[PDB]
Copies of this chain bind each other. A is one copy, B any other.
Amino acid sequence: AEEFPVPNGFESAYREVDGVKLHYVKGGQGPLVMLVHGFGQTWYEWHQLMPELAKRFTVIAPDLPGLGQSEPPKTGYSGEQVAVYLHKLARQFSPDRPFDLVAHDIGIWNTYPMVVKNQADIARLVYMQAPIPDARIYRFPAFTAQGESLVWHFSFFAADDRLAETLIAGKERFFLEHFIKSHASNTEVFSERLLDLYARSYAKPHSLNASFEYYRALNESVRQNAELAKTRLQMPTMTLAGGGHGGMGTFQLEQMKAYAEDVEGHVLPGCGHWLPEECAAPMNRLVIDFLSRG
């Protein structure tokens, strides 16, 4: 069974990595690019970018552990733990050559440790729409005068007593439409049909729990990254952020400059958090062009 339709010419498959069965969608030929999704979504957020990249690259889009059709991690949900699974998966298909990485939202959290620990394996890097876990996340406001606090959900999802699963179970489709649209500028792209697909996937009980365990591990990820960030990233990097409602704005690039020697940043006007869907044309173009420099 497939939770989301696979683009023509791609294959849906699974690979066991350190005892965990990871789902991915793969296609194309050439150097490897791995695309890593974020909270509320799956590999499918990349499905419009994937055929374009596949004309020049081998493209793999995994489901994060516990999300989509991937099994939960056996070690834990901190960034350093999850990054092992994703690094080993990529190196199964690119064992002798560096690969490219594109990551959105908690895909950043779950890849930054393996990038910094294996820099020679990463040719080029694209990060969009999330802070790298560090002390900056403690400075975001709980409540704002205009618009809405971007990351109050950090506390909601990290709260104990399984607060978030207990309240959201049975109401997953309602909650996800609210979460997605509240973090969007171009809300009209989130049709009821598309929201149905995403909601059905993260409503699987182990996926609803997995979703929030990433946030329950966030403070551990911060502590991990305080050590890892003593070495800056050396490979070419690009950041993308939305400039509209839900967007990170200038924060994405300004934080990345503390982490990367070679970084260029873009803020996409009229676009929120969900860049591949809200602003497919400019986002796809920026990513394809940046990766095609190599």
Contact = CB atoms under 8 A, between A and B. Distances in A.
Interface stretch (A87-95, A150-158, A242-250): A150-158
Contacts of A143: 137-138, 140, 151-152, 154-155, 158, 218
Interface string A252-292: 00000000000000000000000000000000000000000
A144 interface: yes
A166 interface: yes
A142 B149 contact: yes
A163 B178 contact: yes
Contacts of A141: 138-142
A56 to B, nearest CB: 39
Interface in A178-219: 178, 182, 218-219
This chain: copies in complex: 2
Contacts of A150: 142
A222 interface: yes
B138 A148 contact: no
Nearest to A154: B143
Nearest to A140: B142
12 contacts: A138-B144, A138-B145, A140-B142, A140-B143, A145-B219, A147-B155, A147-B159, A148-B155, A149-B152, A152-B156, A163-B175, A163-B178
A109 to B, nearest CB: 13
Nearest to A182: B159
A171 interface: yes
A161 interface: yes
Interface string A213-252: 0000011001000000000000000000000000000000
B148 A142 contact: no
A142 B152 CA distance: 5
B147 A160 contact: yes
A148 B139 contact: no
A219 B138 contact: no
Contact of A178 (B149, B155, B161): B161
Contacts of A178: 159, 161, 163
A224 to B, nearest CB: 13
Nearest to A215: B143
A166 B171 contact: yes
Given A140-B143, A152-B156, 10 more contacts: A137-B143, A141-B141, A142-B151, A142-B152, A143-B158, A147-B155, A148-B155, A149-B154, A159-B178, A161-B174
